[PDB]
Amino acid sequence: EEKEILWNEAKAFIAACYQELGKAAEVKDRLADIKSEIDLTGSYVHTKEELEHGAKMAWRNSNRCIGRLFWNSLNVIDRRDVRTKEEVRDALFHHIETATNNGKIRPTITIFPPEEKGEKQVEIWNSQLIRYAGYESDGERIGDPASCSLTAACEELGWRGERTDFDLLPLIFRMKGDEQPVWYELPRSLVIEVPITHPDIEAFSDLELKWYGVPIISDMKLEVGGIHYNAAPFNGWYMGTEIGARNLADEKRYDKLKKVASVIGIAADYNTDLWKDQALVELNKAVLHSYKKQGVSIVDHHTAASQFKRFEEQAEEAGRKLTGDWTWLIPPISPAATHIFHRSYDNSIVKPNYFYQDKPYE
Amino acid sequence: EEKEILWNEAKAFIAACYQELGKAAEVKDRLADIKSEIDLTGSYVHTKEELEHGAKMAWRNSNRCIGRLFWNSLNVIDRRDVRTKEEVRDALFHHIETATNNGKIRPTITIFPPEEKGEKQVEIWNSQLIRYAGYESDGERIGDPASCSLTAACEELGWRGERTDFDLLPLIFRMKGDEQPVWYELPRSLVIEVPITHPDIEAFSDLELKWYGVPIISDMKLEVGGIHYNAAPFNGWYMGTEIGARNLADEKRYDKLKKVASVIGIAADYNTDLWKDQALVELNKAVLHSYKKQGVSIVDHHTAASQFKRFEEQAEEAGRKLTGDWTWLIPPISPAATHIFHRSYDNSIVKPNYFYQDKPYE
Ligand code: HEM
Numbered sequence: 040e041e042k043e044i045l046w047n048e049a050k051a052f053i054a055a056c057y058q059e060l061g062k063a064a065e066v067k068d069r070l071a072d073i074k075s076e077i078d079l080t081g082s083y084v085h086t087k088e089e090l091e092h093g094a095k096m097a098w099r100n101s102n103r104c105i106g107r108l109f110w111n112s113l114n115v116i117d118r119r120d121v122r123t124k125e126e127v128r129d130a131l132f133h134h135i136e137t138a139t140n141n142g143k144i145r146p147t148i149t150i151f152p153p154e155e156k157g158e159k160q161v162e163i164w165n166s167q168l169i170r171y172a173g174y175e176s177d178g179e180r181i182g183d184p185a186s187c188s189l190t191a192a193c194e195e196l197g198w199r200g201e202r203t204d205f206d207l208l209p210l211i212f213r214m215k216g217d218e219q220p221v222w223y224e225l226p227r228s229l230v231i232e233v234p235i236t237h238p239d240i241e242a243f244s245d246l247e248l249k250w251y252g253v254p255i256i257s258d259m260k261l262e263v264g265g266i267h268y269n270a271a272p273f274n275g276w277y278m279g280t281e282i283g284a285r286n287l288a289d290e291k292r293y294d295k296l297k298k299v300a301s302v303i304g305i306a307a308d309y310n311t312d313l314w315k316d317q318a319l320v321e322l323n324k325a326v327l328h329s330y331k332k333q334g335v336s337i338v339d340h341h342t343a344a345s346q347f348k349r350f351e352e353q354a355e356e357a358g359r360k361l362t363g364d365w366t367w368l369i370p371p372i373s374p375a376a377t378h379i380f381h382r383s384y385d386n387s388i389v390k391p392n393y394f395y396q397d398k399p400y401e
Numbered sequence: 402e403e404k405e406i407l408w409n410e411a412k413a414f415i416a417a418c419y420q421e422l423g424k425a426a427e428v429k430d431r432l433a434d435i436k437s438e439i440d441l442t443g444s445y446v447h448t449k450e451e452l453e454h455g456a457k458m459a460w461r462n463s464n465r466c467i468g469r470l471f472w473n474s475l476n477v478i479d480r481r482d483v484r485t486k487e488e489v490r491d492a493l494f495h496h497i498e499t500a501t502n503n504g505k506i507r508p509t510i511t512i513f514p515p516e517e518k519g520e521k522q523v524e525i526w527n528s529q530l531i532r533y534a535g536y537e538s539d540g541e542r543i544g545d546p547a548s549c550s551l552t553a554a555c556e557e558l559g560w561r562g563e564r565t566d567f568d569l570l571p572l573i574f575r576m577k578g579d580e581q582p583v584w585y586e587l588p589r590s591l592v593i594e595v596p597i598t599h600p601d602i603e604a605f606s607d608l609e610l611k612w613y614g615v616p617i618i619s620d621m622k623l624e625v626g627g628i629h630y631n632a633a634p635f636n637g638w639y640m641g642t643e644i645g646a647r648n649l650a651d652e653k654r655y656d657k658l659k660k661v662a663s664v665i666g667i668a669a670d671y672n673t674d675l676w677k678d679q680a681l682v683e684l685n686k687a688v689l690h691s692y693k694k695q696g697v698s699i700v701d702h703h704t705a706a707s708q709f710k711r712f713e714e715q716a717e718e719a720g721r722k723l724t725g726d727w728t729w730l731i732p733p734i735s736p737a738a739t740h741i742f743h744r745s746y747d748n749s750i751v752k753p754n755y756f757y758q759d760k761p762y763e
């Protein structure tokens with residue numbers, strides 16, 4: 040029935056994978072084992088090599104990702120053995136610790152057991168493992184609006200935030216068979232944060248801005264050879280503009296441009312003054328300066344685009360078709376100063392890859 | 402034969418056009434006249450109203466244009482009567498004069514006779530009526546590289562540029578039946594230019610930058626109800642970023658960022674300093690400041706995006722589907738500070754509209 044779809048993706052993956060691993064001879068027999076394993080059990084289990092390489096391929100095929108040059112150095116933690124919520128929690132804690140690596144961030148993914156019957160084994164509620172809570176009631180707007188609904192979900196379960204602008208959300212997830220998720224407060228020793236200061240403008244610290252060191256996306260599905268790993272959090276390091284041009288800048292996020300304009304001492308009254316643009320540049324300089332000063336890995340959008348240019352060259356000379364989403368590849372500031380802006384990209388979806396899936400809350 | 406295609410577009414245009422003009426009753430009879438006129442002559446001639454409204458509709462349907470709020474105030478000059486190159490020249494001169502309007506730019510289009518048998522009556526060689534020449538030989542790079550090939554074509558015909566960085570290209574066009582185009586030097590009294598100065602940084606004038614006041618696109622085809630007006634130059638006013646973030650900024654255009662960085666007194670050594678971004682903002686502030694100070698119409702990208710938001714609202718409440726090209730609608734600086742970035746657009750092509758056509762040179 041539906042089993043047919045699994046087998047097809049399995050054939051396509053193993054061939055491409057073993058070909059890249061120089062194990063092309065091993066394919067016929069590996070596929071055979073898979074064929075009967077699917078027949079008898081409905082599914083099939085990846086080898087360490089298949090899983091590691093598949094997660095790497097998936098990153099390589101992520102059209103919206105400018106950081107793909109480094110796809111082959113992805114650190115893959117295999118946690119398909121977890122059976123308990125204490126094990127899941129500790130796996131998540133460990134991922135944070137090893138990925139952070141005292142500021143010298145290692146791109147890492149932790150892979151939990153895949154969906155069985157489409158039925159999840161572990162269901163992560165966090166959008167990122169480290170994220171700030173958001174509150175909204177009676178005109179009062181506190182923290183990160185992006186987190187408003189998860190925050191309300193957490194507070195249903197007996198969590199309570201301090202209602203600071205930077206409350207760390209607890210880890211929150213649900214195990215198969217449990218009707219309700221559990222939540223665990225993040226140990227503050229695990230979480231690096233960076234205060235935002237400006238290299239030249241000493242008053243920038245009056246804004247009392249900060250951001251977390253490591254963005255760990257925990258709400259996407261890794262799909263590898265027909266196998267659906269809904270729980271598979273991954274991280275890289277930030278590109279500065281993600282923090283300075285979006286998280287802290289967007290009107291629906293922290294909305295700090297008017298405040299930035301004030302501390303940098305420019306008026307925020309006239310569009311033709313380009314005060315938003317000027318505020319953006321200083322905020323973004325501030326962010327890069329602050330991460331580098333603390334010794335936390337970060338990349339600027341120009342360096343990132345140069346790296347991506349190498350990914351493009353690398354893919355061509357390896358005989359691989361390149362795929363990309365121009366609308367996400369261009370940085371939100373000075374995009375025409377990067378080569379990305381001035382070319383176009385095939386937005387075709389190639390598997391393995393990371394996909395969106397529906398939130399369990401709201 | 403091919404006549405069928407004309408008739409279809411004709412039916413579609415007249416219906417939509419007269420409907421918008423509140424002349425829906427007049428359609429059946431207008432179409433009838435057209436039907437027999439096509440039968441007897443192979444083509445059909447637009448009324449003043451049809452032509453004017455069609456050029457307006459075409460602008461309204463230009464997916465890449467952020468300035469569309471003002472589509473209905475387009476000033477349409479009907480020059481389908483030209484038969485001579487002195488008439489074409491004078492029509493082009495007049496367009497420049499009336500559109501410039503002493504700096505208070507009127508959006509204007511001059512419409513020349515359409516293609517007959519696919520055969521052009523007037524063939525304009527300029528990409529814009531006012532543009533700077535570009536030269537390239539023996540490492541030496543002078544003027545605007547975008548104009549390198551047209552410039553070489555002009556110099557074939559006995560034109561010679563001064564080889565300044567801002568030589569005005571002559572008007573150059575070809576009449577049906579002539580094997581060769583003619584060129585006419587632009588009278589300098591017709592052409593407003595703006596020296597680029599900075600409001601705060603007095604040394605900015607050392608760059609000796611300038612740009613022309615009015616961008617007059619003269620190489621696109623206006624298509625209205627099956628009729629192909631290949632020669633139909635049009636203008637608006639600039640959005641500042643077109644000059645400051647592209648014409649003067651691009652490495653393949655004037656490439657001035659390093660020089661800007663120098664006069665504004667910041668180092669241009671480290672990506673993480675965001676010196677390109679900072680140079681961009683100051684150059685773009687300089688451009689808006691300079692146009693406004695001279696009294697030449699210009700719009701900043703924030704004001705432009707606000708206007709386009711009104712176009713969006715206006716289209717919806719008029720019951721018209723909106724179409725757009727997100728990749729051209731976002732400004733090349735601070736695009737995430739505009740609403741455009743945060744929504745998406747249907748890039749469908751609706752006629753009437755402006756289309757690319759092949760250059761006659763190179
Ligand atoms: C090593 C440093 C990395 C950098 C600097 C980087 C940079 C980025 C940036 C800027 C985005 C766009 C996000 C946005 O603008 O909203 C992005 C998207 C993405 N990146 Fe990366 N990335 C890195 C590593 C990774 C890793 C390790 C993975 C997974 C293994 C990954 C997978 C993705 C995916 C799936 C998206 C798209 C998410 C979506 O569609 O919403 N990246 N990356």
Ligand code: HEM
Pocket residue numbers: 456460463465466467468469471475508509510635636637638639640643700705729755
């Ligand atoms: C009134 C002031 C106007 C402003 C500020 C404006 C602004 C712009 C801008 C910024 C672009 C993109 C060009 C680029 O980034 O390379 C554009 C494209 C365009 N505009 Fe407008 N525009 C205006 C008036 C007009 C008029 C009067 C017409 C024709 C009647 C027009 C038709 C177009 C077309 C056809 C394009 C796309 C050209 C292409 O595909 O290469 N616009 N406009």
Ligand SMILES: N=C(Nc1cccc(OC[C@@H](O)c2cccc(NC(=N)c3cccs3)c2)c1)c1cccs1
Pocket residue numbers: 254255256273274275276277278281366367742743
């Ligand atoms: N950036 C856009 N969308 C958007 C809007 C709001 C939030 C958002 O978060 C991405 C966030 O979830 C995310 C996803 C994937 C990677 C990152 N950033 C990172 N450095 C990494 C996290 C984990 C590995 S790399 C961040 C993306 C648009 C571009 C064009 C039109 S809209």
Ligand SMILES: N=C(Nc1cccc(OC[C@@H](O)c2cccc(NC(=N)c3cccs3)c2)c1)c1cccs1
Pocket residue numbers: 380381616617618635636637638639640643728729
């Ligand atoms: N801007 C882009 N392409 C591009 C690259 C080089 C030159 C160029 O010139 C447009 C130039 O011919 C042009 C065309 C139409 C309008 C304008 N600008 C104006 N204000 C007007 C001229 C006439 C009426 S409005 C200018 C456009 C891209 C966006 C995203 C990916 S590439």
Ligand SMILES: [Cl-]
Pocket residue numbers: 254281286
């Ligand atoms: Cl983020």
Ligand SMILES: [Cl-]
Pocket residue numbers: 616643648
């Ligand atoms: Cl231009």
